[PDB]
Design an enzyme around this catalytic site. Sequence first.
Site, mmCIF file in Angstrom:
data_model
loop_
_atom_site.group_PDB
_atom_site.id
_atom_site.type_symbol
_atom_site.label_atom_id
_atom_site.label_comp_id
_atom_site.label_asym_id
_atom_site.label_seq_id
_atom_site.Cartn_x
_atom_site.Cartn_y
_atom_site.Cartn_z
ATOM 1 N N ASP A 10 4.178 -61.226 33.459
ATOM 2 C CA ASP A 10 3.376 -62.501 33.668
ATOM 3 C C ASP A 10 1.891 -62.449 33.529
ATOM 4 O O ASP A 10 1.394 -61.795 34.652
ATOM 5 C CB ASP A 10 4.014 -63.132 34.961
ATOM 6 C CG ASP A 10 3.164 -64.481 35.262
ATOM 7 O OD1 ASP A 10 2.557 -65.227 34.356
ATOM 8 O OD2 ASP A 10 3.359 -65.185 36.273
ATOM 9 N N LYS A 71 -7.690 -66.236 29.840
ATOM 10 C CA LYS A 71 -6.694 -66.781 29.048
ATOM 11 C C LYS A 71 -6.861 -68.168 28.715
ATOM 12 O O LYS A 71 -6.455 -69.095 28.106
ATOM 13 C CB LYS A 71 -5.405 -67.222 30.144
ATOM 14 C CG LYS A 71 -4.334 -67.696 29.995
ATOM 15 C CD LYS A 71 -3.166 -67.343 30.926
ATOM 16 C CE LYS A 71 -1.960 -68.043 30.465
ATOM 17 N NZ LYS A 71 -0.748 -67.792 31.492
ATOM 18 N N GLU A 175 6.584 -69.501 29.760
ATOM 19 C CA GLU A 175 6.746 -69.307 30.986
ATOM 20 C C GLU A 175 7.773 -70.107 31.854
ATOM 21 O O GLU A 175 8.427 -69.268 32.419
ATOM 22 C CB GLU A 175 5.262 -69.588 31.589
ATOM 23 C CG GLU A 175 4.347 -68.585 31.527
ATOM 24 C CD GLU A 175 2.772 -68.716 31.780
ATOM 25 O OE1 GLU A 175 2.304 -69.927 32.326
ATOM 26 O OE2 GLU A 175 1.815 -68.236 31.201
ATOM 27 N N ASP A 199 5.121 -75.862 37.968
ATOM 28 C CA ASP A 199 4.299 -74.602 38.170
ATOM 29 C C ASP A 199 2.993 -74.967 38.834
ATOM 30 O O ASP A 199 2.090 -75.307 37.850
ATOM 31 C CB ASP A 199 4.379 -73.994 36.812
ATOM 32 C CG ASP A 199 3.845 -72.733 36.750
ATOM 33 O OD1 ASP A 199 3.246 -72.039 37.801
ATOM 34 O OD2 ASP A 199 3.840 -71.906 35.669
#
Length: 385
Positions: A10, A71, A175, A199
């Site tokens: 991850d 990211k 994800e 999330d």
Amino acid sequence: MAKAAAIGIDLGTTYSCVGVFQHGKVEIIANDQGNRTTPSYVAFTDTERLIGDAAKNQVALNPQNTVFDAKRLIGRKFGDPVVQSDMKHWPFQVINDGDKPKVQVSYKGETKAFYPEEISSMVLTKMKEIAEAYLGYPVTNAVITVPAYFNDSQRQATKDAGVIAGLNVLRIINEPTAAAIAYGLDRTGKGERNVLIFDLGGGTFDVSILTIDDGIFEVKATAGDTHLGGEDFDNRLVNHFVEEFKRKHKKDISQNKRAVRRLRTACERAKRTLSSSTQASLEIDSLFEGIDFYTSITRARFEELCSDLFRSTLEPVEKALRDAKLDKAQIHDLVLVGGSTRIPKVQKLLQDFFNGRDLNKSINPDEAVAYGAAVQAAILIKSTR
Ligand SMILES: Nc1ncnc2c1nc(Cl)n2[C@@H]1O[C@H](CO)[C@@H](O)[C@H]1O
């Protein structure tokens, strides 16, 4: 041996996690400091390059050369309004190399510039070495996860980060799909299964709705807030304690960078304690001008401090349901992802919104994505033989 082995990674905005599926179980691999998640940070110093915990631990002392949030840049053009907006908030320099962003730092006394995929490859190399130290042999096959809203360019730059890191990228998976795999939600037999993944991480909030029809995953909706996470809750605690210090001592600490950072890390720790106790104690020796700051806070006061932020997590849930054209009762499963979903008030708000429904939360939420990626990496490497 190594050729029949595969890891699941991850690669998160603020933290990364690595898992391996062997002997019928997922093992989330602890790093050399015993942590099951590793900060997505890379520091460039006068003698070395640091990755993870060691990089995060010296961020205050070296902010211009400590890279994080890569990211947010990966697969994007320099001119992208997301890049231009984010750049104003980072202490490191972002430069333009033919419409591609590069992070520019000082390393061993020299100016060096890196592509976001080169920064992410250093985080990936660390995750690869954490797995190798646990297994006792080099593992190179990996499944790497990305947000469900990542486009082809962001997915390709993530795969490129994997190649630079020396990993054979078996697949780039979403994800929320990895999280649904972690809970075995793709193995319920026949018929369309609607899954909502909530999330809430350190710096981002994502709501995803998936339909699982006979093992096939389909993304119905993505919603959220790219600038909402656990660190906003730490900052609400910081402002409270700055006002409490002013009431007790008639001194404003907000300008003392060291005092604010020590208070910030203590607040983050107290916030975590508040997920399992109804009170937490702060114990800061000589916070400002030799004054100790020994205090406490209830879970009730913390909930008040973040009340508006916790409630704001329900607008993207409603938005995702309308985009997916589904009513609440049409959602079969609710999955929690991200460390911040451990907050009891957040769980209560989501459960009440879904009319008292049970939540899937038995897998450590900050580990569920790596868990599913590890399961998928095992299935994929077995099919490759
Ligand atoms: N026990 C916890 N109670 C509340 N917040 C938590 C908890 N654990 C983590 Cl990690 N976080 C936060 O999750 C993010 C990483 O996913 C960070 O913001 C961390 O503080």
